[PDB]
């Protein structure tokens, strides 16, 4: 338009919380002046400003003192590339659809993303908590329907892509390692036959999260373990200390009876290249595929994972 003097007021931010005011120059780009930016996701770091963009808010990188502060009280990460995977990711979470299914937020599928899809809803079945700022709020709008930011912070946090297929159970631990599990306690008692007993106390994620069976019984009557030598020494749950537990194992046939578990995934195919699909219950059994949804009385299928509720647990030995 007129050739002259042009700067408009837009905002910056790390957090979408706290907001710069930056008059900007429209004779060049944004790199020019802040760095890489960007607009809901989309990179606009070669571009110049637009009088649309008038008062809009645009996300950078930590380039100041004041900044760095900021993405570190919010998203709770010292990595240098967090800000960039997040935006990147957020450039496609953002198409995705979130339809409520069985009264809890799905996804769509798309990209691979069956086993985001699998995490999301495994979490709503959960009374978990997160302390990074950044997942608290993004996880308080996906229980709304609106689960984009929040699905584009688990990428970024385990640091996988949009389009990859990723596993759930290691996704969950990326994942819980920013959640209040700071009073969750397990402690197992652990018996060689040769070389006497031990107790081993585990806590954070590590209290919560089981690999080698699906059955939260079966931790309790005992599970072997390779011993320092000698056969497979014997291990028990002794106490438990959590508002639920995950039981992992390779996928397997394994029958689901309604009432003794909270909900659990089922996997079908070949390693980092299967499908994923969410196995929980209300009045009846429920078989969760992002936009599907499967009403059955009776379950039998490959399953990797079983949660369950937990309060308080102590043995009877
Ligand atoms: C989807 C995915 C992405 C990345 C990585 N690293 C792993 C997986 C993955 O395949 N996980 C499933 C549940 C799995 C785990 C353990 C043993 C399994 C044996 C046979 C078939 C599946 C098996
Ligand atoms: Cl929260
Ligand atoms: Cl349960
Ligand atoms: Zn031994």
């Known amino acids: 338009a007129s050739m002259e003097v042009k700067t408009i007021k837009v905002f910056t931010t790390v957090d979408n919380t706290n907001l710069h005011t930056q008059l900007v120059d429209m004779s ?3 790199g020019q002046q802040f760095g890489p930016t960007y607009l809901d996701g989309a990179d606009v770091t070669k571009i110049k400003p637009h009088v649309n963009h008038e008062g809009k808010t645009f996300f950078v ?5 004041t900044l760095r502060s900021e993405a570190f009280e919010y998203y709770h990460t010292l990595d240098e590339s967090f800000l960039g995977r997040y935006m990147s990711a957020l450039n496609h979470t953002k198409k995705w659809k979130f339809p409520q299914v069985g009264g809890l937020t799905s996804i769509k599928w798309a990209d691979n993303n069956c086993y985001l899809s699998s995490v ?3 979490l709503q079945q959960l009374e978990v908590k997160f302390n990074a700022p950044a997942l608290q709020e993004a996880y ?3 229980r709304a329907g609106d689960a984009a930011n929040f699905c584009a912070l688990i990428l970024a946090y385990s640091n996988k892509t949009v389009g990859e297929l990723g596993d759930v159970r290691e996704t969950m631990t990326h994942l819980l390692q920013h959640a209040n599990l700071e009073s969750a306690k397990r402690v197992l ?3 060689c036959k040769h070389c006497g007993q031990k107790t081993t106390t585990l806590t ?3 209290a919560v999260m089981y690999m080698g069976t699906l059955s939260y019984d079966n931790l309790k009557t005992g599970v072997s373990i390779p011993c320092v030598c000698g056969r497979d020494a014997t291990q028990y749950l002794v106490q438990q200390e959590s508002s639920f537990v995950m039981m992992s194992a390779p ?3 394994y029958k689901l009876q309604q ?4 909900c659990a995934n089922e996997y079908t195919g070949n390693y980092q290249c299967g499908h994923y699909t969410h196995i929980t219950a209300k009045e009846t059994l429920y078989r969760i595929d992002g936009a599907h949804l499967t009403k059955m009385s009776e379950y039998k299928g490959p399953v990797t994972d079983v949660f369950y509720k937990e309060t308080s647990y102590t043995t009877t030995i």
Do not use: Q
């Open 28 to 30: 060049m780009t944004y």
């Open 61 to 65: 990188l930590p380039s100041d003192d």
């Open 120 to 122: 999301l809803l495994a």
């Open 140 to 142: 308080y709008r996906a």
């Open 189 to 191: 008692n652990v018996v």
């Open 204 to 206: 954070g994620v590590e």
């Open 251 to 253: 996928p397997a046939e």
């Open 259 to 262: 009432g003794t578990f909270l």
